[PDB]
Structure formats: C-alpha cells, structure tokens
From a paper:
In the bloodstream an unusually tight interaction between the bacteria and the brain microvasculature endothelial cells is established, leading to cortical plaque formation that results in opening of the blood brain barrier and bacterial invasion of the brain. This interaction is mediated by Type IV pili (T4P), long thin polymers of [name] proteins that interact with two endothelial cell receptors, CD147 and the β2 adrenergic receptor (β2AR). [name] PilE (Nm PilE) is 78% identical to Ng PilE and 100% identical in α1. Here we report the 1.44 Å X-ray crystal structure of Nm PilE and a cryoEM reconstruction of the Nm pilus at higher resolution, ∼6 Å, than any T4P structure reported previously.
The Iterative Helical Real Space Reconstruction (IHRSR)41 approach was used to obtain the reconstruction, which after sorting converged to a rise of 10.3 Å and a rotation of 100.8° for the subset of segments used. The cryoEM map, with an estimated resolution of ∼6 Å, shows well-defined density for the PilE globular domain, with a central depression and a protruding ridge on one side. Rod-like density is present in the core of the filament consistent with the protruding N-terminal α-helical segments of PilE, α1N. This density shows that the α1N segments are staggered in a helical array in the filament core and partially tilted relative to the filament axis, with their N termini close to the centre of the filament and their C termini lying at a larger radius. In our Nm T4P model the α1 segment 24–53 is curved but runs roughly parallel to the filament axis while α1:1-14 is tilted with its N terminus oriented toward the centre of the filament. The cryoEM map shows that α1 is non-helical between the helix-breaking residues Gly14 and Pro22.
Numbering used by the authors:
A (entry chain C), B (entry chain B), D (entry chain A): 1 to 161
C (entry chain E): 55 to 161
Amino acid sequence: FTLIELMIVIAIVGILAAVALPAYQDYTARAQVSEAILLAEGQKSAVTEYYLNHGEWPGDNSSAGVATSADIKGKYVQSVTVANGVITAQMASSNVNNEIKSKKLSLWAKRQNGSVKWFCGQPVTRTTATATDVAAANGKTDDKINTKHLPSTCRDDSSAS
Amino acid sequence: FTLIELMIVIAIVGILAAVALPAYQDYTARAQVSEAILLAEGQKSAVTEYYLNHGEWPGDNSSAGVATSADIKGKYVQSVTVANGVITAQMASSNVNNEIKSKKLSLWAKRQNGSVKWFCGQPVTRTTATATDVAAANGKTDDKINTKHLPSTCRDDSSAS
Amino acid sequence: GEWPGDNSSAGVATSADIKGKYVQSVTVANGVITAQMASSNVNNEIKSKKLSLWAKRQNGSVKWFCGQPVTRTTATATDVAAANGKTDDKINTKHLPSTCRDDSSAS
Amino acid sequence: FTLIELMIVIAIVGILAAVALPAYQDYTARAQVSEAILLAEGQKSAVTEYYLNHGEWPGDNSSAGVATSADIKGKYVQSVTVANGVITAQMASSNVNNEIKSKKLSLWAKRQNGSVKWFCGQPVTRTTATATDVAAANGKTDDKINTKHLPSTCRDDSSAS
C-alpha cells in the first residue's frame, strides 16, 4: 500500500495540476493594457500645446490637429483619442487577455501649482476643451480597465485633478 | 518520501516567498524622487536670469520673482524653492517610498569657464544670492535624499561647484 | 567607466545591508557582488556560504557571472580575482545548479 | 526533478544575469558626449561675426577674440576650441563612458545659398580662417567620436560643407 503512498503522490499530483494558477490572464492584461498606455502619451504635447497656446485643451485630436481615434495605433491599440485634452486609447479585440479585450483609460491633465497634472486612469473626458476638470464618461466600464488588471498607479478617475 | 522531495519542493518554496526582494521600495523612490527633480528645473532660468541680469543669484523664487516654495508643485512635490539661486523641491508625504517620504535636494550653479554649473544634489543653499558657493543646509538629512535612493549622478553636495 | 569598489563606492546597501533568509551578507567588490548563506536552518553544509557576481565588458556591454566568491582586481577593471575565502563561502558546484558555477576567471 | 525544473529556472536565471545588456555605456556616452556638444554652440556667433565682419572665419577663439580651448568648460568638457571658424570641444577624462573619455568633434560652417551651414561632426579644422572648406584633422580619432556613440545626425566630417 505504498501504492496508496504512490497513489497519494498520484492523488496529490491529481489535484495539483488544476486551479493552482491565479491571475496570470489578469497579469498579462496589465502589460497588454499598459502597452496601450504607451502610445497616446505623445499626444499630450499638442494637447498641452493647444492648451498651452490657447489656454484651452483641444476638444480632441482634431482640435489639437493630431492623430485621431482610429489614428495612431498598433498592437493592443484599436483607438487613440483625445477628449477636451483628455486622451484615451483602447485595447485590441484579440490575442489579449480575453478580459481586457477592447478596453480604455483616459488621460486628463488639470492645472497645477505647476502647469498641470495628467492622470493615467479610467476612460473619462474633460467637461470642456476650455476646462481642466474632466467627466467620468465611463462607457459602462467595458473600456474602463480593472484597477486589478491595472497596475497600482494607473488607477485614476475623471475626478483626478 | 518523495513526500520529503515534495515537502522539499514545498520547503524550498517555503523559504522562497520571503525576503527575496531587495531594494524595490528603494528603487521606486529614485523615480518617485526623480519626479520631484523634474519640476524646479525651469526655475533655473530666471534664477540664472536674475544672476544673468544682476550678477547675483536670486535669494529665492521671490527675489527672482518666481513660483515660491508652496508654488509650483504636484505629485511627489510638496515644495519647490530657490535659495540664493539654489533651487530645491520636496518629496510628497504619502503614496511614496515610505522612506523618501517628504525629501529634497538642492540645485546650485557655480560659475564656470563656461557660465556656471548647476548640481542635482543634496538640499543646500547658496551663501549669498550674490555668491555662487552654496552651503550644505542639510535639514538633518530628512529632506536630503539617499544617494542610494538617488541615482548615481544626482549625488551632489553644496560643495559641488 | 569603473565598477564601484563596493556598495559604498556605488553608494548602495552594504554587506550587512540588504538581507533576510539565507542571506547574512550582501556585498560588492569592485563591481563584483556577493552574498552569504545564513548560518542555520540551512543545509548544514552550505551554512554561511557565498558566491560573487562579476561583469566583464563585452561586445555588448558586459557579462556578469553567478559563481564563486571572487573580487575585481580594481573598481576600474573588469577582470576579477578569485578571492576564495578558503572556499567556505564558496559554494559546491554540486550544491550549486549547473549554470551558477563561475570563477573570477569568468569574463 | 521539478528540482531540475527548478534548477532550470535557476539555470535560465543562471545565464540570464550576464551579457544581457547591450550598448548602454555606449548610450550614456552619446548624451555624455552630447553634453559637450551643448557648449561651444555659442562660440559660433563671433566665429560667424568674425566671418561676418571680415568674410573670414576666426582662426580660433582668439582670432575671434573669444573663450579659448581651456576656456569655456565644465562637465564632459575639458576643452572648447575654434579652428579657422571650426569649433571643437572635448569629452572629460572621467565619470564618462570609459570609451568616449576625452573625445571631440568639430563644428564647421561652409557658405550656402543661405549664409553658411555648420556641421556637428568629427574633429576637423578649416583650411584657412579665410576659407570655408575644412580639413579632417582627425587626432587619430581618439577625440573623434564614434558615430555609434554619436547620435544619427551629428556624424559629420570636414568634408561636410
């Protein structure tokens, strides 16, 4: 009945190759998400510049005069969009974490002691291109990204100022 | 007693998920610190200009006529200050490396073959707005930042000339 | 262009700095870094043992080496010296895995 | 023999912390180099002015009447020199990329449809202060800087006209 001991070793192996893997489709997502974060970053400039020139954020890419929603893109990026200076990009719809598939988070800068502070966080939009305060246009959170599937920092709401 | 071998694999896992992570609260700090570095940089201009116009550094932001201590700020920046042309900003007091929480380092330019050379390094202050030589006003090193928690370069003392 | 003679040359966590389980020292030697086994709850054998970490400059930048406690001739240099500590801290290549079997000579 | 799998993970870590870092002593150099580029720029004016006034470049700083070789300097700059209007500065001899340690590249403007075009590139010198064409005085390329360790643009030879 070392066989048991064997079948034990079998048994413990039996229930050892199942459900012993947390959150990795969760984890890949973050980077897979974060890949999307990497792109619209540059848009912030003319967005600022537009705000810099004018004092008002650009209502969008085109207000800024820059690459629109369906513009600048690639892997994990099926849109890149500005909203009254609030910039946003979307996850791809495949080869992703099945979860984060096609998700976004906005990028909104509200004026500081310094110039302004952006925010890597939830899909939101600025009340006006003129304003700095932005609105949590949540898109029923689909594009919104799990703060879990987000890293610790990039967990911002429109409220972020 | 493959169970041992198992419990070994357990055991080696046992003492594998503890203390195997150096210095990352240390590392984040650097950037979290370095974020603070990013801001007072612009102040150097009028500071120079003040020194440029006058031949004397500005005793501070206000001597220069520029954004004071509690002026220009944001994340990881709970002050930004000039001291006889020596400029300094402080770490935030939260969401930081618990270590570097609320820390500074000065920025002091002393006149060159060229114009002058600044220094990213420890909270210090210039002897006079007129001078270039600066004093290692150390604030008991709290605001002073760990050269470890600093990157290799930004390791300057008032002595830096 | 020179390695740090140690943690402090680098300005970083010294020998008795960064540590925990199975780590009773962590030390740099002219850019050659080393840590020691604990002195208990270990393999009674490997109890209190080390192996250095030395990078010598490449076609690429440089290549480190997980292997025996050694030290770099100079902080300036890349070549490192097999400061062997009478092999106590040195670790059995058997009690080491196949890869982490490097001597100062490793370049 | 998950131990193997372990020692594998060890092994792959074994040969993972060695030689997996290209060209960064190469990269720092560029900026460390480029720092040196930043300085002699202003010399171009009186150099031009000398050429502007006269029609001839200044044989040097002193011909122009400006800050000589061992003049204007600082970090990564252990000389700044003009050569018949061709200006040049040298890398420091420490705290640098051990490679680029003490290296130069000239700065030579040759007359255009417009006025003239300078060139950020290899240590060279102008045939005459009167001329525009410059000579690839190469100093056995030590001061000359690796086009790799240079950025893409600043890759000019005396021939650059």
